[PDB]
Amino acid sequence: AITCGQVTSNLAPCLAYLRNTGPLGRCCGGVKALVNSARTTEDRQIACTCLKSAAGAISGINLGKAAGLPSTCGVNIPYKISPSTDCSKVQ
């Protein structure tokens, strides 16, 4: 089943980039994998909420880099990675 636990494991390098402190490293590769588990409508919603939660979990989180993370790691996700956009209503 889909779960934030699996999603946050791939974010390990992103979590550091989100805080404007550690390099992206494999953040793009991790997210790239998630994208595939983030396009069947619900899989997508699970990732959005998990990521939103991930950003909210980070302490010195940079909202601009979070929202611009998928732009930095060019990926085909139809939602921005930020604790603000809702995903449950994404069709």
Helical residues, percent = 40-55%
Shape verdict:
globular
Helix-and-strand structural type = mainly alpha
How many β-strands, per DSSP?
0
Q: Kindly report the CATH topology.
A: Hydrophobic Seed Protein
Termini separation: 21 Å
Which band does the percent of strand residues land in? under 5%
User: SSE order in H/E notation?
Assistant: HHHHH
Query: What profile does the largest beta sheet have?
Result: none
Q: Number of folding domains?
A: 1
Cα-atom radius of gyration: 12 Å
Say which CATH homologous superfamily is assigned. Plant lipid-transfer and hydrophobic proteins
Level-1 CATH class name: Mainly Alpha
The oligomeric status of these chains comes to monomer
Number of helices: 5
The CATH architecture classification is: Orthogonal Bundle
List the helices and strands and how they pair.
Blueprint: H1 4-10, H2 12-18, H3 27-36, H4 42-57, H5 63-72
Helix pairs in contact: 1-4, 2-3
PDB class: lipid transport
Keywords: cystein rich protein, lipid transfer protein, lipid transport
Assembly: monomeric
